[PDB]
Design a protein around this ligand. Sequence first.
Ligand SMILES: [Cl-]
Ligand SMILES: [Cl-]
Ligand SMILES: [Cl-]
Ligand SMILES: [Cl-]
Ligand SMILES: [Cl-]
Ligand SMILES: [Cl-]
Lengths: 173, 173, 173, 173, 173, 173
Amino acid sequence: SSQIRQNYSTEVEAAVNRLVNLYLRASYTYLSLGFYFDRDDVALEGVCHFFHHLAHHKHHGAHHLLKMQNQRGGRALFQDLQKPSQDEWGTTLDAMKAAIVLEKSLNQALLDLHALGSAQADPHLCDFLESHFLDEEVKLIKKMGDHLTNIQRLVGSQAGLGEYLFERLTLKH
Amino acid sequence: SSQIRQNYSTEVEAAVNRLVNLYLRASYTYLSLGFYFDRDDVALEGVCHFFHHLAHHKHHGAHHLLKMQNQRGGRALFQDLQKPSQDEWGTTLDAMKAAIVLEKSLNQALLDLHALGSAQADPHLCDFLESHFLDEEVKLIKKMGDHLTNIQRLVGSQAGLGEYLFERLTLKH
Amino acid sequence: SSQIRQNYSTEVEAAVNRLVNLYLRASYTYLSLGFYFDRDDVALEGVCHFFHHLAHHKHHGAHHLLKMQNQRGGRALFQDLQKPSQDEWGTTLDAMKAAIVLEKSLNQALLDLHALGSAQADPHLCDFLESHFLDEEVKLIKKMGDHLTNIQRLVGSQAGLGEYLFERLTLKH
Amino acid sequence: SSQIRQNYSTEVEAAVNRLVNLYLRASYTYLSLGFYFDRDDVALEGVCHFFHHLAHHKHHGAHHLLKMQNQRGGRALFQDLQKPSQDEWGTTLDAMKAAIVLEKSLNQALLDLHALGSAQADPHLCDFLESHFLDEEVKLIKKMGDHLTNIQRLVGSQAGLGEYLFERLTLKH
Amino acid sequence: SSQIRQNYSTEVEAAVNRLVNLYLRASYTYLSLGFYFDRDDVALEGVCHFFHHLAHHKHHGAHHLLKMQNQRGGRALFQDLQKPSQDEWGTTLDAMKAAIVLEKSLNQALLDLHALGSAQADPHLCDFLESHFLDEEVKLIKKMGDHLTNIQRLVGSQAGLGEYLFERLTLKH
Amino acid sequence: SSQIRQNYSTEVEAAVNRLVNLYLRASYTYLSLGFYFDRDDVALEGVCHFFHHLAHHKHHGAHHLLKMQNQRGGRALFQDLQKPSQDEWGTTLDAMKAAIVLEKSLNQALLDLHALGSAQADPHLCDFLESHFLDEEVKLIKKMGDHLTNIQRLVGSQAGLGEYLFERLTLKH
Ligand SMILES: [Cl-]
Ligand SMILES: [Cl-]
Ligand SMILES: [Cl-]
Ligand SMILES: [Cl-]
Ligand SMILES: [Cl-]
Ligand SMILES: [Cl-]
């Protein structure tokens, strides 16, 4: 029986715990993507840094959701975290395609939770997602789309050259 | 067929991937312990900070192991991460007892891997564990033992008072 | 046959060598007291620092006596140093009681040597003890008495709580 | 008859002198590789700087081994230094392949000496190699493997373009 | 029954307490050597400073061993400290010969304990001795050997002149 | 067929490669001389530093010759480097006599190459040797002659004393 809980539905509490799982799964996926690009037989430092920074960002997102759960008087509940969908991530292009799929799934989870908060008349939850997550997701997906276009442009008939140039001249090393 | 791999056994490579799993499980356990102490109905900030800093340290340990795996020409392989052993962690004393159990299990995993590296005549692996992990673990376990003794001293017949004073005067808020 | 010795009795020379033994025994006792309080199953950092600083002070006292022995043209002679009187030192209260007993024995040795110097009309020795040792001893014994009173006040019927609070709020960590 | 020698086998002393020869041969090989890339008809400044910095590093390694030989009470003995295996070093790719072969041979010599020190119960020698050489070698071989992968990616069907871009955008000029 | 002890044999615990005794005996020997050189009838300030700095170093070594004993969950046990082997230490040459004998005995005690730790599969103990003591001992013995050679060179048929010049031009005053 | 080579005879090109061999042999000789003086049973730090600085200078000379070979469009060709003429170098006097013999042989090689350049009407080569090498050699030989005179003065009938004083008061430690 919570001393602080007010206007915080069990449905939102549960959805917040599921979204924490999704963010931690996303962080784990980005950890795996980064270390694949660090392999001596892949060796694309800028791609490794791009994904490791996203791993840190998704962990921070989980921390914000868990802090908000406690601020509202909900109860953090952790589930098993599934391994990433692949052990090897192919080319930079394959990896950036897999990343935008992942981000679109996170974005839909955020929109779904926002819609539940709207239906539950939970404006604190709706504001929380707007201020911490919805514009970060739109900006990240726009950046990944920009990268996909530049990677695609660079394939031509010299894939290796393009993959090197993208990593050297667009990403940070 | 690795261009860099030299003196790096498949047995060590696999053991390193298992130890990464153990460190990431430990990080997840500390995430759960920290957010339990952040609950409005628990509210021990110094205990929350103690465990969240350990969560970050264990994540960094996993990152070091994964960097070393790639430096040696091994292949990072990620498995499902099991949820922490509890959803609620009891008193500071219960939590610090669970933490020293966890740390003793990590320490034994480090000693086991060191012994495998010794048997495989892999001095780079042995040095790596000595320089990054074995003394950090001894120092952390000594610190937890010191804390257990101070928590135990403070229980007396006023458990609440002792739990507050330990958090206020030994831990950092 | 000393080129510098003047007004320096064989009795004082010998007493100075015995007092060096007493100071080095005191330093050793404080080394043992400090490491007992550093044990994981004792874990009172401020008590450990209190005694280790006294170990350093008593070593410096021995160094001053040995420097003065050579300045007067006496001959330093070292004897076996006996181990401390205990291997385990009980509570902070037991330890501070043992420390004030030790300090009272040092103080009496200083007064005895001062009286011998007075009888031998050795004003340099008398001045030396007044300026380096007699007021330091009075001040240290007064400080230990103050601590004993505060420790005693804190025992009540919650010994553990009192022992923690004294270490946290009077001693330095 | 050495005044300082203790626990330092004739076998280790001799192996240390042979390893000094290997390091000085490696320094000489890197001197030759660097000046080949400085030729007006090769003209890859970043490749010249990469190899000349390794020449300096291998000379410093020899100096450390010779200092340690004297610290242990062994006797430095110098042998003829063989010229490098080639007069002309082909492409950047040929040169980086020859460098990783050379480094793998140095690394095996270090592991062999570490194993001899282990068998001779010479922990100072084992520590010395761990602290000065084994991780530097692993890190250098990982860096060369990363470079090989990037050079290979860049060959495509425009070898010249790739060789220029690698030197301009990965190496330092 | 220790809350922290893990992989720490009773054999190592006892050997660590004996090595503490050896270090404190060494500190006491250096205290006596330093004050002999401070005598008005010896008066070699640089030799006095050389030995007093070693006395401080050996005391610090004992403190490190005692800290590590508690970090591992062993129990510090102190024994009587025997007086130094001599009351008067002869020439600088006699004293530096006695010092290198002492250091070789400490070094053998360190190697013996390292070998016991190796046999007990105690890599934390082995690392601890490597990182804190084995190279300091090799470096100190090399320095003493260098000094012995310079002192020996200076004896000629004017021992006094040589002893003065060594103290003035090699040691620090 | 060189794009840059102009007025650069095959005779000079070959002589430059031989002089590189002589400089690298000289560097190796100075490496051996320096480590002999670092021995615990020789222990003359200033003599060790004197020779190690010359080893570095002779390596730099080789680097200048090799840079100039490429600037002129000649081709660096490396030969086996012979070990130094001795394993042990006797007294400071023996060593400084061997050094001035070595320097006189380098100086004659420089004069011989200058004479060949003069005969070949190669003023760039002649200027190069004048500006980088001929005055450095004259100055170094003058310094060694000055040292020989001071060492010789100091032998008297107390060789050891003189050898110590020269190292302490003329050379740098
Ligand atoms: Cl799965
Ligand atoms: Cl589970
Ligand atoms: Cl006793
Ligand atoms: Cl050859
Ligand atoms: Cl005795
Ligand atoms: Cl030869």
